[PDB]
Design a protein around this ligand. Structure first.
Ligand SMILES: [Cl-]
Length: 202
């Protein structure tokens, strides 16, 4: 299936761009969403986490108390492997299920912040969500509860803004009026529909 990679640094707001594509019927594959889905309220995996580590793992709406789980793994690094053994097969199965259930002309793949492979191994086109460096820092401080220096450190460990822009086929600046960002998405959506038709004609 014709695949567009959606990439962007921390604080780029790319999940809001992904949502705009989703609103046009595009299947969005996002490992961060799928990881939350496999431990949703009522799931066997969430029960296993609570039965091992305790009822403090579950908040009052039934969802995972992520910080309490992070604390447990931080105290006992051996429980990383247990958690990966529980969740990794579920994440693989759910990723594949969502891909197989897709009926859209193309797929949008939200690239993780830590990328292991060349994006061109998977993507037919690369879309970078770009914002100024200071916007990344500002948004990360507000959303993630980190200090400025921490945000600057995360940036230093990610691909640079310049490397991301150079690798991109298209760039969407997640800046200015939200209406205009959404119109930019709609314009790119048309380009991707045509490219998917061209790829399928072959
Ligand atoms: Cl292309």
């Amino acid at each position: 299936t014709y695949t567009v990679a959606l990439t962007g640094g921390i604080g780029s707001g790319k999940s809001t761009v992904a949502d705009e594509f989703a609103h046009l019927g595009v299947t969005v594959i996002d490992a961060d969403i799928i990881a939350r889905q496999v431990v949703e309220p009522g799931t066997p995996a969430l029960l296993a986490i609570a039965e091992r580590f305790g009822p403090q793992m579950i908040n009052d709406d039934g969802s995972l108390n992520r910080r309490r789980l992070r604390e447990r793994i931080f105290a006992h690094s051996e429980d990383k492997a247990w958690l990966n053994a529980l969740l990794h097969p579920l994440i693989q199965q759910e990723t594949r299920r969502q891909m197989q259930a897709s009926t859209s002309p193309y797929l949008l793949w939200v690239v993780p912040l830590l990328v292991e492979n060349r994006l061109t191994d998977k993507a037919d086109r690369i879309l970078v969500v770009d914002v100024p460096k200071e916007t990344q820092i500002e948004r990360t401080i507000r959303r993630d509860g980190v200090s400025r220096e921490h945000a600057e450190h995360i940036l230093a460990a990610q691909a640079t803004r310049e490397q991301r822009l150079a690798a991109a086929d298209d760039v969407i600046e997640n800046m200015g009026s939200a209406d205009a960002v959404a119109s930019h998405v709609a314009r790119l959506h048309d380009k991707y529909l045509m490219l998917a038709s061209q790829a399928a004609s072959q």
